[PDB]
């Protein structure tokens, strides 16, 4: 969205051809305009026929029709039920608080309906005590109870809320924001079920994917934020089993970026299943598609059998006669390399990667997968299943193909992931705070002026919440240097606030500054 949005076009020209003489705001938004000896004082109300006012107000509902009130709706603290506040209170370790706010929202809506009062009377803070937002830790939250008919947030309250939110239009919320609020209710319902199993980097990932499902129109794969939430979770098995139902095809194992974070011991099984599916696609049986998954696993024999049973395919006779050889033989190794480089010139990139993997030249299979096929997701998967979980070919691939673009794009999620897969944990944790161009002589990769800068560098509060997690688990790497680390923690805390404040979550900014623990 633009940082500024027009809300009125005071068109004095519609009455006189004389140019505006002078313009001056005054008390309560009164905008006095002068021309000749003749003033055009406009009050702070709004004319809904204007295209600017109509577009800025959008679908919202506002108590007063004012430029002052409108400018206090498009900006300023969020109502505590706003979806952008609830997801940000979930990313911060305040899930219990979000559950309580949803319960209070239900109670307030029932109160309004029972008294037949208009919903616009709904309290923005839902009668919450502000100190609740400042509680340092999720398990220290005083989760009080309510009267018997609905004592604590649960499935019944969830369904009642999802009904009410369709039977009423919450104030200040564009209908799309209300849809995302309903999806947040569903996500909290899911988390409450899994809340007893997955640590809280599992809860953040679960909400990330549940929000992804509602935005497949504009979002083509879970952000690297969610991949990094899951990558550092201790319960990757639970997350994978929760999103498994959606991973039927490779195109859906590439949306959830499973190759990045799922455990190698599950990535092997997922390649087996994805090979099964990719073979028996909608069209017909074709061992060409599932070749890479079966070779990466080192199951050339299954691929050979697959080619054999594919009697109808035109390529069958050549491939059965070729693949059956033993590619430890130098002559056949060179023959397979030659065929791989021929297929790279006949524009058959996937087959070139397959052949480059027959001979165990992984460094050439993964470079054909990430550079000519454009699947870094599949390259990482093949690296992780074929050779091992972390490096050595994966390290070179990431440092060559991903690190430069990450530095140019100034992306710190990718940089942290890369320095994690290189098992450079001590600097992988630091890459979350300091920009990639300043890490490990990365300035040698690209000139500092080529990198993105200016307003495009919008912070990401979650990026800090991850650090405070890793920083606390990997203290061994931070005891050696405290003053230098604090010098940048105290900068990124004040730069993460001032976006938590610019995105309306002031209550979370105060919590972040209040509760941050400096490692003395």
Partner 1 sequence: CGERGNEMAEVLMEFPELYTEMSGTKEPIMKRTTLVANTSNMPVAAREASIYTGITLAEYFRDQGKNVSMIADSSSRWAEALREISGRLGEMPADQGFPAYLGAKLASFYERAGKAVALGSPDRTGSVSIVAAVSPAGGDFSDPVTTATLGITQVF
For partner 1, which residue of 137, 245, 346, 487 counts as binding (CB under 8 A)? 346
At 42 the three-state DSSP class reads: strand
* # residues near partner 1 by CB under 8 A: 3
CB of 367 to partner 1, least distance (A): 14
Q: What does DSSP assign to residue 116? A: T
**Nearest-approach distance from CB 353 to partner 1, in angstroms:** 15
Stretch that binds partner 1, among 189-197, 341-349, 384-392, 444-452 (CB under 8 A): 341-349
Q: Which of the residues 273 through 332 are near partner 1 (CB under 8 A)? A: none
> What's the closest the beta carbon of residue 346 comes to partner 1, in angstroms?
7
340 binds partner 1, rule: CB under 8 A: no
Give, to the nearest 10 degrees, the angle between helix 236-243 and helix 175-194.
130
Judged by CB under 8 A, the residue of 3, 37, 49, 345 near partner 1 is 345
Give the integer Cα–Cα distance in Å for 241 and 251. Answer: 18
374 binds partner 1 (CB under 8 A): no
**Interface region with partner 1, contact rule CB under 8 A, candidates 171-179, 343-351, 357-365, 455-463:** 343-351
Of 137, 138, 157, 139, nearest to 147 (Cα)? 157
**Nearest to 398, CA basis, from 360, 370, 365, 356:** 370
Which residues in 148-207 contact partner 1 (CB under 8 A)?
Answer: none
Shortest separation between residue 251's beta carbon and partner 1, angstroms: 24
Q: How far is the CB of 339 from partner 1 (least distance, A)?
A: 14
397's tokens? 């691939």
Cβ-based nearer residue to partner 1, 177 or 401: 401
Nearer to partner 1, 351 or 489 (CB): 351
How many Cβ atoms are within 10 Å of 190's Cβ, its own excluded? 17
Min separation Cβ 343 and partner 1, Å: 11
Given a contact cutoff of 8 angstroms between Cβ atoms, the answer to whether 173 and 181 are in contact is yes
Angle between helix 224-231 and 412-421 (nearest 10): 40
Q: Which stretch binds partner 1 (CB under 8 A): 70-78, 97-105, 262-270, 345-353?
A: 345-353
Residue with smaller CB distance to partner 1, 145 or 345: 345
For partner 1, give the closer residue by CB, 191 or 353.
353
Asked whether 297 and 272 are in contact (CB, 8 A), the reply is: yes
If the CB atoms of residues 27 and 347 are measured against partner 1, the closer one turns out to be 347
Its sign, for the CA torsion 475, 476, 480, 481, is negative
199 — alpha (psi -120 to 50), left (phi > 0) or beta?
Answer: beta
Establish if 368 lies at the interface with partner 1 (CB under 8 A).
no
Are 270 and 253 within 8 A, CB to CB?
yes
Check binding of 483 to partner 1 (CB under 8 A).
Answer: no
φ/ψ of 23, rounded to 5, equals -130, 135
Least distance between partner 1 and beta carbon 345 (Å): 5
Q: Does 347 interact with partner 1 (rule: CB under 8 A)?
A: yes
Give the nearer residue to partner 1 in terms of CB position, either 167 or 347.
347
Q: Which of 300, 293, 231 is nearest to 262 (CA)?
A: 231
In the complex, what is the shortest distance from the CB of residue 337 to partner 1, in angstroms, rounded to a whole number? 17
359's CB contacts (< 8 A; 6+ apart) are 327, 333, 336, 337, 340
Q: Which stretch binds partner 1 (CB under 8 A): 16-24, 216-224, 339-347, 394-402?
A: 339-347
Integer CA distances (angstroms), 310 to 241, 282, 287, 306, in order: 32, 16, 7, 6
Q: Which is nearer to partner 1, 352 or 463 (by Cβ)? A: 352
Residues lying near partner 1 in the complex (CB under 8 A)? 345-347
């Amino acid at each position: 969205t633009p940082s500024y949005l027009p809300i009125e076009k005071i068109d004095i020209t519609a009455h006189t051809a004389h140019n505006i003489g002078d313009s001056v705001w005054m008390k309560n938004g009164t905008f006095v305009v002068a021309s000749g000896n003749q003033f055009y004082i406009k009050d702070k109300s709004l004319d809904l026929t204007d295209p600017f006012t109509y577009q800025s107000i959008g679908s919202r509902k506002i108590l007063s029709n004012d430029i002052l009130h409108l400018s206090s709706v498009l900006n300023g603290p969020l109502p505590v039920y706003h979806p952008q506040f609830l997801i940000q209170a979930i990313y911060a370790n305040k899930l219990q608080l979000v559950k309580e706010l949803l319960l209070r929202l239900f109670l307030a809506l029932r109160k309004l309906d029972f008294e037949s009062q208009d919903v616009s009377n709904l309290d923005s803070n839902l009668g919450m005590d502000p100190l609740k937002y400042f509680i340092a830790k999720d398990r220290d939250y005083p989760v009080e109870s309510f009267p018997d008919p609905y004592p604590c947030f649960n499935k019944t309250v969830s369904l009642a809320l999802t009904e009410q939110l369709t039977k009423t239009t919450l104030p200040y919320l564009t209908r799309h924001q209300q849809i995302t609020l309903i999806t947040v209710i569903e996500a909290v319902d899911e988390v409450t079920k899994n809340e007893n199993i997955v640590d809280y980097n599992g809860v953040r990932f679960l909400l990330g994917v549940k929000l992804f499902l509602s935005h497949k129109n504009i979002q083509k794969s879970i952000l690297m934020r969610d991949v990094s939430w899951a990558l550092h979770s201790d319960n990757k098995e639970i997350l994978l089993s929760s999103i498994d139902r959606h991973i039927t095809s490779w195109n859906r194992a590439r949306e959830y970026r499973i190759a990045y974070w799922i455990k190698e011991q599950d990535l092997v099984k997922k390649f087996e299943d994805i090979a099964k599916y990719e073979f028996s696609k909608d069209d017909k049986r074709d061992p060409s598609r599932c070749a890479i998954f079966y070779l990466a696993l080192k199951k050339k024999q299954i691929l050979l059998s697959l080619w054999k049973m594919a009697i109808g395919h035109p390529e069958q006779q050549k491939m059965v006669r070729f693949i059956s050889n033993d590619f430890t033989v130098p002559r056949w190794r060179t023959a397979a390399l030659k065929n791989a480089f021929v297929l790279l010139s006949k524009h058959r990139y996937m087959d070139a990667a397959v052949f480059f993997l027959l001979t165990d030249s992984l460094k050439d299979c993964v470079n054909v997968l990430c550079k000519q096929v454009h699947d870094m997701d599949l390259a990482i998967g093949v690296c992780r299943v074929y050779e091992g979980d972390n490096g050595p070919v994966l390290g070179e691939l990431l440092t060559a193909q991903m690190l430069p673009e990450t530095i140019k794009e100034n992306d710190r999620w990718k940089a942290s992931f890369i320095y994690w897969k290189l098992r450079k944990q001590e600097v992988a944790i630091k890459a979350l705070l300091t920009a990639p161009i300043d890490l490990e002589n990365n300035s040698s990769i690209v000139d500092k002026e080529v990198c993105v800068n200016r307003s495009f560098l919008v912070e990401d509060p979650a990026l800090l919440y991850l650090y405070n997690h890793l920083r606390n688990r990997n203290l061994k790497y931070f005891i050696g240097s405290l003053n230098v680390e604090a010098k940048i923690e105290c900068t990124l805390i004040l730069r993460v606030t001032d976006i938590l404040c610019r995105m309306g979550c002031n209550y979370l900014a105060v919590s972040l500054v209040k509760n941050w623990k400096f490692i003395e």
